[PDB]
Amino acid sequence: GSSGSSGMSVNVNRSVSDQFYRYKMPRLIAKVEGKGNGIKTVIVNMVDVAKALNRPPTYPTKYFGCELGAQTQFDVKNDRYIVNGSHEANKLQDMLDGFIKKFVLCPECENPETDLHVNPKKQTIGNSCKACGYRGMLDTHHKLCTFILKNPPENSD
Ligand SMILES: [Zn+2]
């Protein structure tokens, strides 16, 4: 029984420097091959991190591409996600931070106990927080929105 744990997780947010935060998320992993001759980043821990955030990897995965300004591959069959370009986990984490700071967490209470809503008629995205009581329409993204609309989030029973 090695001294300690096997896998360590970081705080839901990269702004807190304490060990009191209950909710935790597994540090995403980014893989890279070659250099220039077809170098691309593959977020192996794309599906994992998602589940933890109670959200699909399609939300974050897509983001990376936007910010990075590159293309991305989506394969549900093998749940494999690829992001054109070279980016180390360290960086990817930061880039995602933002998303996990507004989408996931609440801009009022910063609680991961929030959700998102999609309107096919109004064609506008909006979140609703219960912890504090915040509501509104998320700034219509550039491409993401287009994807979200075409394919709404998964419902629960
Ligand atoms: Zn809130």
UniProtKB/Swiss-Prot annotation:
Disulphide bridges: none
Site, Arginine finger: residue positions: 22
Post-translational modification Phosphoserine, affected residues: 17
Residues the entry annotates as binding GTP: 34-41
Subcellular location field: Cytoplasm
Stretches that traverse the bilayer: none
Source taxon at top rank: Eukaryota
Family: Belongs to the eIF-2-beta/eIF-5 family.
The protein's role, per its UniProt record: Component of the 43S pre-initiation complex (43S PIC), which binds to the mRNA cap-proximal region, scans mRNA 5'-untranslated region, and locates the initiation codon. In this complex, acts as a GTPase-activating protein, by promoting GTP hydrolysis by eIF2G (EIF2S3). During scanning, interacts with both EIF1 (via its C-terminal domain (CTD)) and EIF1A (via its NTD). This interaction with EIF1A contributes to the maintenance of EIF1 within the open 43S PIC. When start codon is recognized, EIF5, via its NTD, induces eIF2G (EIF2S3) to hydrolyze the GTP.
Oligomeric and partner information: Component of the 43S pre-initiation complex (43S PIC), which is composed of the 40S ribosomal subunit, EIF1, eIF1A (EIF1AX), eIF3 complex, EIF5 and eIF2-GTP-initiator tRNA complex (eIF2 ternary complex). Interacts with eIF1A (EIF1AX) during scanning. Interacts through its C-terminal domain (CTD) with EIF1 or with eIF2-beta (EIF2S2) (mutually exclusive) through a common binding site. Interacts through its C-terminal domain (CTD) with the CTD of EIF5B. Interacts with FMR1 isoform 6; this interaction occurs in a RNA-dependent manner.
Protein name per its UniProtKB record: Eukaryotic translation initiation factor 5
Gene (UniProt): EIF5
Full protein stretch here: 1 to 150 of 431
